[PDB]
Amino acid sequence: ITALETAIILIAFVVVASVFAFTILSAGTFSTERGKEAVYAGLSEVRSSIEIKGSVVIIGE
Amino acid sequence: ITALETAIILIAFVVVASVFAFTILSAGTFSTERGKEAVYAGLSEVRSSIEIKGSVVIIGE
Structure with missing residues (x-):
């Protein structure tokens, strides 16, 4: 038939x-996770600076 | 006469x-059941798949 x-x-x-x-x-879930992780990272380094506050002193021996 | x-x-x-x-x-009867067997076997062939879930892992020694 x-x-x-x-x-x-x-x-x-x-x-x-x-x-x-x-x-x-399954493939789409992994790629979405990785993209989210990148943004979280980016912001972090931008806000992690350091300053020097005051004079610089030399101790002589 | x-x-x-x-x-x-x-x-x-x-x-x-x-x-x-x-x-x-009797010959017709044998042909029918023999013909009947083939269609059952074909259906079971198609529905018996297997798939991988997850990711492959290697155990080093």
């Missing part, structure tokens, strides 16, 4: 799409 | 038809 043939082909394409979809879902 | 021999010739032909009918009867 054309019917019995079509069922087997139909299942195969669905499974392939399902597996591909699962991979995309 | 021919009826005498006619009857004998008639009986022979029906017996041959009976035996042929019996053989084709």
Whole structure:
């Protein structure tokens, strides 16, 4: 039958799409996490400076 | 008369038809179940996949 043939082909394409979809879902989560981490980092270094306050003294021996 | 021999010739032909009918009867049954087996096997083939979840890990020694 054309019917019995079509069922087997139909299942195969669905499974392939399902597996591909699962991979995309997992892949997208990792990339999103990495992008967030970069921004958190950037800000940090910018606000971490140091100043010198006062004169500079030399002790002679 | 021919009826005498006619009857004998008639009986022979029906017996041959009976035996042929019996053989084709059983032969058709075997073909069906053999045909029935194939479609069941094909469906189980397509639905038996496996996928990797997570990430691969190497244990050094």
